[PDB]
Design a protein around this motif. Structure first.
Motif, PDB file in Angstrom:
ATOM      1  N   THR A   1       0.815  -1.174   0.000  1.00 56.50           N
ATOM      2  CA  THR A   1       0.000   0.000   0.000  1.00 56.50           C
ATOM      3  C   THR A   1       0.868   1.250   0.000  1.00 56.50           C
ATOM      4  OG1 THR A   1      -1.798  -1.111   1.190  1.00 56.50           O
ATOM      5  CG2 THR A   1      -1.642   1.278   1.419  1.00 56.50           C
ATOM      6  N   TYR A   2       0.622   2.145  -0.935  1.00 56.32           N
ATOM      7  CA  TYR A   2       1.353   3.396  -0.986  1.00 56.32           C
ATOM      8  C   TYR A   2       0.397   4.578  -0.914  1.00 56.32           C
ATOM      9  CZ  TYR A   2       5.440   0.662  -2.440  1.00 56.32           C
ATOM     10  OH  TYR A   2       6.484  -0.235  -2.509  1.00 56.32           O
ATOM     11  N   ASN A   3       0.538   5.383   0.127  1.00 57.52           N
ATOM     12  CA  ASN A   3      -0.192   6.637   0.210  1.00 57.52           C
ATOM     13  C   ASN A   3       0.550   7.664  -0.606  1.00 57.52           C
ATOM     14  OD1 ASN A   3      -2.187   8.457   0.898  1.00 57.52           O
ATOM     15  ND2 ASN A   3      -1.294   9.052   2.865  1.00 57.52           N
ATOM     16  N   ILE A   4       0.014   7.928  -1.773  1.00 53.73           N
ATOM     17  CA  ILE A   4       0.674   8.747  -2.756  1.00 53.73           C
ATOM     18  C   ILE A   4       0.230  10.197  -2.632  1.00 53.73           C
ATOM     19  CG2 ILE A   4       0.915   9.172  -5.231  1.00 53.73           C
ATOM     20  CD1 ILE A   4       0.845   6.253  -5.740  1.00 53.73           C
ATOM     21  N   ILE A   5       1.176  11.052  -2.306  1.00 60.45           N
ATOM     22  CA  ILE A   5       0.906  12.463  -2.122  1.00 60.45           C
ATOM     23  C   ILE A   5       1.703  13.267  -3.141  1.00 60.45           C
ATOM     24  CG2 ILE A   5       1.105  14.406  -0.523  1.00 60.45           C
ATOM     25  CD1 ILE A   5       0.800  12.449   1.742  1.00 60.45           C
ATOM     26  N   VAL A   6       1.172  14.391  -3.571  1.00 56.36           N
ATOM     27  CA  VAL A   6       1.864  15.233  -4.524  1.00 56.36           C
ATOM     28  C   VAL A   6       1.930  16.640  -3.970  1.00 56.36           C
ATOM     29  CG1 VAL A   6       2.042  15.923  -6.938  1.00 56.36           C
ATOM     30  CG2 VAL A   6       0.733  13.869  -6.345  1.00 56.36           C
ATOM     31  N   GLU A   7       3.133  17.120  -3.724  1.00 58.23           N
ATOM     32  CA  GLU A   7       3.314  18.438  -3.151  1.00 58.23           C
ATOM     33  C   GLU A   7       4.128  19.316  -4.090  1.00 58.23           C
ATOM     34  OE1 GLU A   7       4.919  16.756   0.688  1.00 58.23           O
ATOM     35  OE2 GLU A   7       3.385  18.051   1.558  1.00 58.23           O
TER      36      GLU A   7
ATOM     37  N   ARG B   1       6.276  23.355  -0.154  1.00 60.62           N
ATOM     38  CA  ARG B   1       5.637  22.257  -0.853  1.00 60.62           C
ATOM     39  C   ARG B   1       4.150  22.211  -0.519  1.00 60.62           C
ATOM     40  NH1 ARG B   1      10.018  17.448  -0.047  1.00 60.62           N
ATOM     41  NH2 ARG B   1      11.935  18.625  -0.491  1.00 60.62           N
ATOM     42  N   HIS B   2       3.332  22.575  -1.492  1.00 60.58           N
ATOM     43  CA  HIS B   2       1.889  22.697  -1.289  1.00 60.58           C
ATOM     44  C   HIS B   2       1.174  21.380  -1.645  1.00 60.58           C
ATOM     45  CE1 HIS B   2       1.600  27.306  -1.157  1.00 60.58           C
ATOM     46  NE2 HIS B   2       2.865  27.086  -1.457  1.00 60.58           N
ATOM     47  N   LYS B   3       0.224  20.928  -0.807  1.00 55.93           N
ATOM     48  CA  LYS B   3      -0.610  19.738  -1.160  1.00 55.93           C
ATOM     49  C   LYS B   3      -1.347  19.982  -2.467  1.00 55.93           C
ATOM     50  CE  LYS B   3      -1.657  16.411   0.962  1.00 55.93           C
ATOM     51  NZ  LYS B   3      -2.876  16.509   1.813  1.00 55.93           N
ATOM     52  N   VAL B   4      -1.100  19.125  -3.434  1.00 58.44           N
ATOM     53  CA  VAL B   4      -1.811  19.164  -4.698  1.00 58.44           C
ATOM     54  C   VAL B   4      -2.739  17.974  -4.801  1.00 58.44           C
ATOM     55  CG1 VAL B   4      -1.539  19.312  -7.203  1.00 58.44           C
ATOM     56  CG2 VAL B   4       0.272  20.133  -5.663  1.00 58.44           C
TER      57      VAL B   4
END
Length: 86
Positions: A60-66, A73-76
């Motif tokens: 399981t990968y919690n994929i975040i893009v900042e 680094r802003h949450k996208v």
């Protein structure tokens, strides 16, 4: 060569909406269940989609893009994805 231990290499083409003139989109794949460290992918700040190779299927990968923009680094994007077929 490229594979150097991971041959169970799955690819996740994750796409996001243009945040605008980002210097860097660091994607943070945080593995859940394992002791794997967060795979951090740095794609070009104008790119809005990335094929992510090296995600170990079955994990399981919690994929975040900042978005790296003005030093920060802003949450996208953020989404939890188990890789493989499940």
């Amino acid at each position: 060569n490229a594979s150097t231990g991971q041959e169970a290499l799955s690819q996740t083409t994750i796409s996001w909406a243009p945040f605008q003139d980002t210097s860097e989109y660091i994607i943070s794949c945080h593995p859940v269940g394992t002791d794997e460290e967060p795979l951090q992918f740095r794609v070009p700040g104008t790119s809005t989609s990335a094929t992510l190779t090296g995600l170990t299927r079955g994990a399981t990968y919690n994929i975040i893009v900042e978005a790296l923009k003005d030093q920060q680094r802003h949450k996208v994007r953020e989404e939890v994805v188990t890789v493989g077929n499940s």
